[PDB]
């Protein structure tokens, strides 16, 4: 501060940020190359948001495209946060009390908390002043941070794809604000004698983001257009017949019952929702159409398919035999055996797993679909609860005609529910390749800790204890990951888990089914499952003291 | 007002998920304050309404928990395990035993909801209401 | 009332749990005691005789009977209806 | 005939509970 | 006001030429300028003055076998100012 101005030794040290200028140069070169190859149009601008001369936590890159609507300028911005590992932000301190002693907890600050209302206000004012329009309206298009520990010198493809996607998002938000024809399933008939088919898939390698961020995905549900006519030409050649893709994985939760209902309940978590690669448009009415595919995974209990053991290898991280540790027998059920097969795998699932699953979503305010995750988070609960629900109902009505009131009543029925759970987002480098941090779940922790139930119970309470403070839960979760996974964990963000309403999913599915949407797709005896429906409730009908005392009332 | 209550256990006839035993609460005495010298029928129902309030925090199960230091062995709750899956009795008065698994025992062997009963007496102090209820 | 070693107590202290504690493992005797209370087939006089014998067997020789009482069960819906009616009638009671 | 238990006590059971008086950070939204 | 923050480390400190330096305890001095309506949330202006790297070592006094057998000696390795101060 004033010490440097008080002594004034010749020469300058530090006092600069070097992960912004290089990124700006790279982005300018990429934009020039893309414009040269007739890939984009010279109608957008790239600007730098320096932290030094704006006094903000993190520098950012903003991509602004402006149009004119009825004489009123409109500017759309897609900020890109640029976290740096060379500087440390001050931590947040919290105090908790235990008996007669008080202590201080040093938390950590994520990217999400940096992007506050004041940050966006300063960014909008800076953009308005730079572009020469002081009173122009500014609309957000969805932030997307660039993860640290990424070398920009050899990552040109990811940056190029991110820039094109950002331009597409700006165009999408501008078109939505201007007002265009909504996307409806009535226009999907094609009037050419084709049908829509849904294909399920079981995967073992994680999916990848546009910047190489791994995403856990065990079950993948896709929707395609099947146009197989009689003498179909183009053998072995396919014309982009694919529309949607949803990545899902199942997790087990244990209900608190002391020891006929199964002890464990299976909950399915939706991680990523996206459209086809060929489709360059993203509109709100496609999101619900893509999300409707999640419910179709229960057609043949396909959510249990990843649980069955694979033949030849055993990673011992997702083993299902650990479920027997707390069963009636203390030991674990031994898979990988000649006798073990699907014959009693179904018996085990019937006797220890509830038949019906639970649907959950990992909403993220900083992901690719931030503009919908934020809306759903607002609809879950807060000051803006009625407006978000009304907007969602209006969008669902716009997708597929109307008359959604016959199946759902948003006035007296919650849409989304918040479970009060915060999930860290990170990646750990396995021996073979980089993986996702969310691979560690209840089953993984149970496998890691063979017989010590108390440690596992402590881990389980470290996730959803309502009494314990959230900072302590985050500390315990960060310690357990280090204990089990390894030393290569690198956190990147935060996410929140929410539970959909049970009736909402069924109502949405029935509404889409009734709206003219038709989707087609795809042993030892155990007993009579239909004899129990017919049972006599009544009993055969055949003809076949009380001493009292004085009462003043009567 | 003042209402005196005590709980008793009844066993449903089921051969061997529902708990085997059901807790029934018996109301013995209902009375007003000592200072109040008036007794009217409409005060009796107002006083009796306090009986239902004992289930606000499962307060009817509080006397069941073991006391520290003494054991009369007349109201011991460990005898409930005699007919359980294990023949022997659960041993209280131990260092490991506490409220941590007392709740587990009550969940696994006692129905969550109680039953309300009254011991009407035609010759007691409140005879004029006991006779009417009889 | 039966006179305990310290002070006089109440005869109703003997309940199902007390009988179960007194008879450690013999289930048949306890079941006989339980049937001596609410068997509908058996005559009431025999039930009173068995109950008077069991009290002498367990409690002591100081039992002194004074009267009779009858047990009744309130309707489940009646209590809830009464509570809701009083609550809606402007009565507010607060506690832990 | 031997007694087995009370088959009528389970019909009367209280369903309710005694009635006594006794964050959400947000961000910018383009929709509103 | 001036505040001193203690720190426990496990990775060695580095010299200006990459030479590692052992440092288990780090003591720093900062300027705390938190006023009422402080602006610049999440932004800090170089509030740090000094830094001292220390680590402890045990020495045994020569007594044959109430005083403890071992005595702890703290060794100061590096003393330096803040990066901003030139």
Residue numbers in the entry:
A (entry chain D): 48 to 306, 319 to 581, 590 to 611, 622 to 631
B (entry chain A): 291 to 306, 319 to 436
C (entry chain A): 486 to 581
D (entry chain G): 590 to 611, 622 to 631
E (entry chain M): 242 to 306, 319 to 339
What did the authors write?
Combining cryo-electron tomography of nuclear shells in bacteriophage-infected cells and cryo-electron microscopy of a minimal chimallin compartment in vitro, we show that chimallin self-assembles as a flexible sheet into closed micrometre-scale compartments. We find that the shell is primarily composed of a single protein, chimallin, which self-assembles through its extended N and C termini into a closed compartment.
Using the maps for the tetrameric face and full cubic assembly, we built models for the higher-order chimallin oligomers to understand the subunit interconnectivity. CTS1 extends from one protomer to a neighbouring protomer positioned anticlockwise around the three-fold symmetry axis of the cube, and CTS2 further extends anticlockwise to the third subunit around the same axis.
